[PDB]
Every structure is written in C-alpha cells, then in structure tokens.
Design a protein around this ligand. Structure first.
Ligand SMILES: Cc1nc2ccc(N)cc2nc1C
Ligand SMILES: [Mg+2]
Ligand SMILES: [Zn+2]
Length: 313
C-alpha cells in the first residue's frame, strides 16, 4: 500500500503535459498507466495485484496492427489523465476510476478495419451489432476480462457503484465511434451557447464525457509535429490495408484509403482537422477551459500540414 510507482525525472514532469509521448519502450507503458491511476484516483482505487493482472490481460487482447494497438490504448488514457488532472474538482471518484479504464479498454481486439469494412465484408460482429460494431465489441471484450478470476479491479465497489462505473465505461466506449461524435458535439455546441449546459444533469455529463473520449482518441493531432506526422503514417498504413481489402471485395475505396492516391493525404488531413479535430477541441475548450493546450497544439499541427501542401515540407 506504501508502494508508489515513480518515473524518471523527465517523464515525471512531461507526463503532466497534454503533448506527452509515452515513448518506444513497451515495457514502461504498464507502469506509466499505474502511475496515472495512482495520481488521478489514489493508491487505494485498485488492488495493485488485480490492476496489474488486468493491465496485462488488456495488453494481451490488443493486436499487432500499425495503429489500433497497445500504444494507442495507453496514449488515449494518458490524454484522459491530462484532462482529469487539469479539471480536478469537476469529476466524481467513480468517473476518475472508470474513464482511465475506459480509455485503456476502448479499442480492445481491434483488427485495423472500420465499421464500414465490417458491414461490406459481412463480418459476424456486424450481425451481432448493427451500429457502433467495433465499439460494442470493445465493450464486450472489456466485460470479458473484468470477469476472469483475479481481474475484477472494481470488486470493492457496492452493487450500485459497480453498475454506475460499468455504465460510465460503456457510454465512454460507444462514444469513441466517430460517426456518433458530430451530433454529440453539435448538441454540446447549442447547449453551451443557448446557456442550458448543466453538469448536474446526467445526460449532459454523458455528452461531455463523450466529447472528452473523442478528444483523447484523436490526441495524435495534439502532439509535437514529428510525433503527429509519424503517427499519421501508422494511421494511413491501416487505412491503405482497408482500401486494398475493399478492392478485393470489388469496391473502389474512398481516396483516403487508396494507396494509389497518397498525393491527396495532406488535403485529406486538412479536411480532417477542419471537419473533426478543430471543432472537437474548440467545444472541449469552451466546456473545459484548462484543455486549451489541446486546441492550440491541434491548430499548430493544421499549420504544419498547410506547410506540407505548400511544399515547404
Ligand atoms: C490523424 C487522423 N486522421 C484521420 C483521418 C480520417 C479519419 N476517419 C480519422 C482520423 N483520425 C486521426 C487521428
Ligand atoms: Mg475505436
Ligand atoms: Zn481509438
């Protein structure tokens, strides 16, 4: 119980910043996550025996794909940490517990293909789950691992506290479905502007946790430019594998997934920053002022992509 996780000095300082990169040493990532749980939640929130067993089973259930991998899990959870640490007083003990676990679990057993490719392939998961296919699957894998002997990190919570946290994790994981993000943010936009946004209203909290989940999930666009640029190669490697698979089903994929159309990537990233990322970090900064460093980093990276187009890189 008097066993604190610590980090080397550079990490101990940088981990507190939104643009922290967790590094290329896979074996440090579990202790990075536990470090974050201990400061966000307490040394008490979890039995360390069960937490570590849980962390290693989650690691095991992420596949070896270019982007939707164990590194993405820990990276999304570190963004959620930065958010929770800059908005201390706005979140319950249960939400702090649940959200770091939702982030680590949010892409469990991802194969690197979109909901669309699952529906066109006619994958069984697409008969089981007609919308948010992968995300209902990621939530299912999360419950599965929570139910393995010695893996129930929530065992100490009341029957009703247990139901509440599992409901936070489910809504948090479904929200990562980017097809749901647009309406969710448009609603937060109106609510904030017309003045009816209210964090005592649970349905409004749900929406705000959803937008945070989208923000953490897209956090590649909020890093230092060389991290953003190198992550985008991993992202596109999956996109082009999916477009190849489309071509194999006899469907011309969208250009963004066509490896014959790499020339259009910089313009495709502009759309993405303008249609998705900038609006996401804007509404987040309005609802949660301390998260502004994410909007600023996102704007800096749009300008780096504009520079790529203008052939200055
Ligand atoms: C950088 C980046 N680019 C994207 C382009 C398209 C898409 N659907 C999702 C994307 N997500 C990220 C994080
Ligand atoms: Mg996902
Ligand atoms: Zn993700």
């Amino acid at each position: 119980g008097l066993m604190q996780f610590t980090l080397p000095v550079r990490l101990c300082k940088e981990i507190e910043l939104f643009h922290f990169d967790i590094g290329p040493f896979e074996n440090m990532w579990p202790g990075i996550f536990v470090y974050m749980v201990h400061r966000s939640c307490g040394t008490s929130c979890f039995e360390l025996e069960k937490l570590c067993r849980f962390i290693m089973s989650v690691k095991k259930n992420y596949r070896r794909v270019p982007y939707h991998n164990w590194k993405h899990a820990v990276t999304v959870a570190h963004c959620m940490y930065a958010i929770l640490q800059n908005n201390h007083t706005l979140f319950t003990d249960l939400e702090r517990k649940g959200l770091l676990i939702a982030c680590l679990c949010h892409d469990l057993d991802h194969r690197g293909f979109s909901n669309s490719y699952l529906q066109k392939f006619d994958h069984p998961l697409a008969a089981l789950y007609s919308t948010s296919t992968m995300e209902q699957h990621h939530f299912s894998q999360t419950v599965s691992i929570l139910q393995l002997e010695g893996h129930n990190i929530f065992s100490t919570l009341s029957s009703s506290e247990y139901e509440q946290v599992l409901e936070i994790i489910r809504k948090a994981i479904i929200a990562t479905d980017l097809a749901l993000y647009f309406g969710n943010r448009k609603q937060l936009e109106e609510m904030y502007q017309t003045g009816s946004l209210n964090l005592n209203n649970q349905s409004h909290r749900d929406r705000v946790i959803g937008l945070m989940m989208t923000a953490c999930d897209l956090c590649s666009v909020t890093k230092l430019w060389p991290v953003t640029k190198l992550t985008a190669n991993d992202i596109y490697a999956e996109f082009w594998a999916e477009g190849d698979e489309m071509k194999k089903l006899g469907i011309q994929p969208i250009p963004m997934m066509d490896r014959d159309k790499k020339d259009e990537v910089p313009q495709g990233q502009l759309g993405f920053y303008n249609a998705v990322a900038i609006p996401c970090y804007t509404t987040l900064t309005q609802i949660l002022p301390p998260t502004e460093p994410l909007l600023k980093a996102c704007r800096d990276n749009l300008s780096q992509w504009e520079k790529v187009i203008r052939g200055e890189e």
